[PDB]
Design an enzyme around this catalytic site. Structure first.
Site, PDB file in Angstrom:
ATOM      1  CB  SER A 139      -1.060   0.042   1.100  1.00  0.00           C
ATOM      2  OG  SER A 139      -2.335   0.735   0.914  1.00  0.00           O
ATOM      3  CD  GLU A 142      -5.072  -4.438  -4.089  1.00  0.00           C
ATOM      4  OE1 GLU A 142      -5.281  -3.712  -3.122  1.00  0.00           O
ATOM      5  OE2 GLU A 142      -4.328  -5.291  -4.289  1.00  0.00           O
ATOM      6  CG  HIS A 186      -5.487  -2.665   0.175  1.00  0.00           C
ATOM      7  ND1 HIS A 186      -4.624  -2.697  -0.853  1.00  0.00           N
ATOM      8  CD2 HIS A 186      -4.965  -1.559   0.960  1.00  0.00           C
ATOM      9  CE1 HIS A 186      -3.805  -1.712  -0.969  1.00  0.00           C
ATOM     10  NE2 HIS A 186      -3.845  -0.924   0.351  1.00  0.00           N
TER      11      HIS A 186
END
Ligand SMILES: CCN(CC)CCNS(=O)(=O)c1ccccc1F
Ligand SMILES: CCN(CC)CCNS(=O)(=O)c1ccccc1F
Ligand SMILES: *[C@@H]1O[C@H](CO)[C@@H](O)[C@H](O)[C@H]1NC(C)=O
Ligand SMILES: *[C@@H]1O[C@H](CO)[C@@H](O)[C@H](O)[C@H]1NC(C)=O
Ligand SMILES: *[C@H]1O[C@H](CO)[C@@H](O)[C@H](O)[C@H]1NC(C)=O
Lengths: 533, 535
Positions: free
Chosen positions: B203, B327, B440
């Site tokens: 990330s 995601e 995610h």
């Protein structure tokens, strides 16, 4: 004097001709005048009813073809010449044809009325592909086809003027429809069961009769093959119509009255010579003189009218062929030809999009390129070629058809939709063009039944299936064989389920969504994008 | 010393350290936790670039994790493992610039390739001390030397008044860089090889890794890079100088505060006051947008990351990039109405249109329409299950998948060796509901090899899967190639190229090569969307 070939209509007596169809005789009444010849002071004018005649009028042969441009791309080539005029050209051309079984039907028979296509600039009811003898003989149908004025003669308009009000080619069609109402019973036809069918510009014409009030008492059902009144090519605004008419006048050495008076002095070929100089952009699938939104024949745009009408009494059969766009690429897009595989570069694809979508701004064009590019293989010539065809086919035919189907269904109409996927074994165009615009027609009319044409035995059977669908629809408003099972059934198209069927050698297959994602792009997003420019 | 473990005693540039012997399932590892690499960025040093830690006297205890950088703490689902696992697990303090080192026990005698982890957390949160970043498994099983550093987040790390001396911006990235420099000087004392340093992050950490690739002074500090679900390019990882100035001055206003005078007032404010107001400065209602992030300044980044990945010569670069299956899902429950972890989150078409405006806050009406056009199933335009999944896809593709695809293609075109993956396995231990898929951040526990912990109740198959991934990652760190040279048997992972666009699927099954990372969809986001915004 065969009494089966002698008919009295309101204008007087007619003598037809006994023709031979593979399975028996048919009665043909060819070259029946339905209007006063639109010549001299009558050029650009609405059609007038044909005056009555004396004695017995010879109706044994096709009359002249309405004056029109003649194709020169591939001289001698059957793929193109099959659409070219097969009789002499003349402005004196308002004649219709009637095929019935021999002998005349014992009971009132459903009537099919064919309206030819040809971009509103060409066409004729006398073409071999429009031969009504097979439908008449095999299905016992009464089939009618009319000539209507095309090009300047049919659609040059100075909106508001008395001497060129516009849409007179459509009025020619309407007058033939009125003729059928008044006279078809004499041939054994049922004036209370009349089905219009047409392809391309003829389908667009059919759609405009649906949308025009005075035409509504003249028929009961409609078939639109690869063409619609809505869309980018079938109509022009009043302003653009006037613009094109005035430009044409200027080009040939010519207030509205004086301008039209001068135009009427010009030989027909002079007008045809300059027909193609009035288009605002370099383009394909765009025609100079087409129906005009005038507030008269059409009270509003087709897009508006299909969105608000009550169409509950309407049954409609609509559809497309597998490769709607391929035919047009060889007529203007650099890189395309019937004489090779037409594998193109990416620059050629981009150039083609501006030509295939001539009204597109740069951003709209980029959007089209974005949608149709295979980004995994963005330079593949085979994909770029087929995508170029898809762009033209979807933009001009498939998505306008999907929109019409969706709109009419939403407004209460009974809709049946098809995709025609069979490529004729006798097709003269190369393989890359697939199943091109116009090549379902020979099957609907039952030409494979002609032993001299060398269609396969499967194609003969396929043709009979299609003739049955079409005539069943004409009879009932439902193409489904009212005596069959395990078929499967052809379900109505709806906005929700979006069911259509594939027409090929295999039995009917039901599919859902007519290019749903792609057509949402053309029908929903693209106008927004052009508006924002 | 004299009565203590002689294998836990190490000297670095700042002085002597004493580490701790930890147990991993296969055996012991050495851990040196809470090593200071900078002077505490407190008081007058707030908003300032870090200064190297001044040498200390005596033996510094490096046996426990240090403070977490001051940050917002999540409150969405109290007591819920799915969120709490990302929450701070040590004291919040501005005194937080410390790093951690895991090595084999005893320490390797020959120079060993180094992995440096940079945590994510949207540049407003995160800590190197989280259990999912535990370096003991990579160290024990793969013999890796693993380093992870804390870096300032939120206002403390990224509040910027561009051009100013007192808040120049990007100091959180400078913290990371100072840690990289610390490794260059000291990692050899631990048996690490400073000539073989691989950065990896997820990330915002992945975006950070990308920043270091693009910033010249960071380039001698590492040799290879791994970017998991994050990029320097894209809509969230950077802001312009003008927008950073805008946000900083607004935040200053909100807490009751000439750049010098403004920043001076800001420094008098309690840390919590800055946190209490940091979320009030976003220009629109949004998700996957963070108030204080790296700024395009002409300094750390000479141009936009988009421009920099387009012109660079990256022949020297070996890079491993990738995404997880879903995601977008994690973010939906934080900002889009109709979404929750506690129901199936089937949404209406109206909720989908509204979510699009929130998921794409920069969009004009026309652009938002284009997104809706692209993601709607026009056969079932009102189907709640599809709309829910489409909403997830919108957020995931826009923020992660397509920026990753762009990065991979751009870097490969500029000469880099790129390996790309999609991670598709959902942990059997996942606490989030099924509709969220593989969210995610949920590949991390596998890369770090947590399934090897018996007490965690992963399946036997998940243990083997974890060991596979640890091998890919360490092979890449060692060689610049995730493939095992001795294994010509197992399926090979081919480099990503613009021509073929090959990437692999990471799941319980052997490697499968696929082509085109959402090619059509990412062409829309990467090529067309910007044109649409301009018009
Ligand atoms: C009526 C069936 N149609 C099917 C193609 C063949 C007739 N020609 S056309 O008007 O469509 C046409 C379009 C473009 C270029 C030439 C041309 F003749
Ligand atoms: C670093 C892994 N990440 C993976 C999800 C979990 C941490 N939270 S976050 O910053 O991404 C974040 C985004 C949106 C809303 C809350 C939130 F915490
Ligand atoms: C196909 O033919 C046309 C004209 O004959 C030509 O312009 C085009 O280049 C040809 N396609 C090739 C060579 O791939
Ligand atoms: C699920 O929960 C959220 C939050 O309470 C709510 O907004 C949404 O309407 C719920 N959806 C359903 C189908 O219950
Ligand atoms: C796994 O083992 C048992 C299941 O019976 C349970 O007591 C324990 O809490 C589980 N551990 C985790 C981390 O879920």
């Amino acid at each position: 004097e065969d009494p089966q070939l002698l008919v009295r209509v309101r204008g007087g007596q007619l003598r037809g001709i006994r023709l031979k169809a593979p399975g028996g005789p048919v009665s043909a009444f060819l070259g029946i005048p339905f209007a006063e010849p639109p010549v001299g002071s009558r050029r650009f004018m609405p059609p007038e009813p044909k005056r009555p005649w004396s004695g017995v009028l010879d109706a044994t042969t096709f009359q002249n073809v309405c004056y029109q441009y003649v194709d020169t791309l591939y001289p001698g080539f059957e793929g193109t010449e099959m659409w070219n005029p097969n009789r002499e050209l003349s402005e004196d051309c308002l004649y219709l044809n009637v095929w019935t079984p021999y002998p005349r039907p014992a009971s009132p028979t459903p009537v099919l009325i064919w309206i030819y296509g040809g971009g509103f600039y060409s066409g004729a009811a006398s073409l071999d592909v429009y031969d009504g003898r097979f439908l008449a003989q095999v299905e016992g149908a009464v089939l009618v086809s009319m000539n209507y004025r095309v090009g300047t003669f049919g659609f040059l308009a100075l909106p508001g003027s008395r001497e060129a009000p516009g849409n007179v080619g459509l009025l020619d069609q309407r007058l033939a429809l009125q003729w059928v109402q008044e006279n078809i019973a004499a041939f054994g036809g049922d004036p209370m069961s009349v089905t219009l069918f047409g392809e391309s510009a003829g389908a667009a014409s059919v759609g405009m009769h649906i949308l025009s009030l005075p035409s509504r008492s003249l028929f009961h059902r409609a078939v639109l093959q690869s063409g619609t009144p809505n869309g980018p090519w079938a109509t022009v605004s009043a302003g653009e119509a006037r613009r094109r008419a005035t430009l044409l006048a200027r080009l040939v050495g010519c207030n509205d009255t004086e301008l039209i008076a001068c135009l009427r002095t010009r030989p027909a070929q002079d007008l045809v010579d300059h027909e193609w100089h009035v288009l605002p952009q370099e383009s394909i699938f765009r025609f100079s003189f087409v129906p005009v939104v005038d507030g008269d024949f059409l009270s509003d745009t087709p897009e508006a009218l299909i969105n608000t009408g009550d169409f509950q009494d309407l049954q409609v059969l609509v559809g497309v062929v597998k490769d709607e766009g391929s035919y047009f690429l060889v007529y203007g897009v650099p890189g395309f030809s019937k004489d090779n595989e037409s594998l193109i570069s990416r620059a050629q694809f981009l150039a083609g999009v501006r030509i295939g979508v001539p009204q597109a701004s740069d951003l709209a064009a980029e959007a089209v390129v974005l949608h149709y590019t295979d980004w995994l293989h963005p330079e593949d010539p085979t994909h770029l070629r087929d995508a170029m065809s898809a762009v033209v086919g979807d933009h001009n035919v498939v998505c306008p058809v999907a929109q019409l189907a969706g709109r009419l269904a939403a407004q209460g109409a009974r809709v049946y939709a098809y995709i025609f996927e069979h490529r004729a074994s006798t097709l003269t165009w190369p393989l890359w063009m697939g199943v091109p615009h116009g090549y379902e027609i020979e099957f609907i009319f039952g030409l494979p039944l002609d032993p001299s044409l060398n269609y396969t035995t499967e194609e003969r059977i396929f043709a009979q299936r299609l003739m049955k669908y079409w005539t069943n629809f004409a009879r009932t408003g439902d193409p489904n064989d009212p005596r069959d099972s395990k078929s499967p059934q052809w379900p109505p198209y709806t906005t929700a389920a979006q069911q259509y069927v594939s027409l090929n050698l295999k039995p009917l297959e039901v599919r859902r969504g007519l290019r749903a994602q792609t057509c949402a792009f053309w029908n929903r997003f693209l106008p927004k994008l052009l508006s924002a420019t």
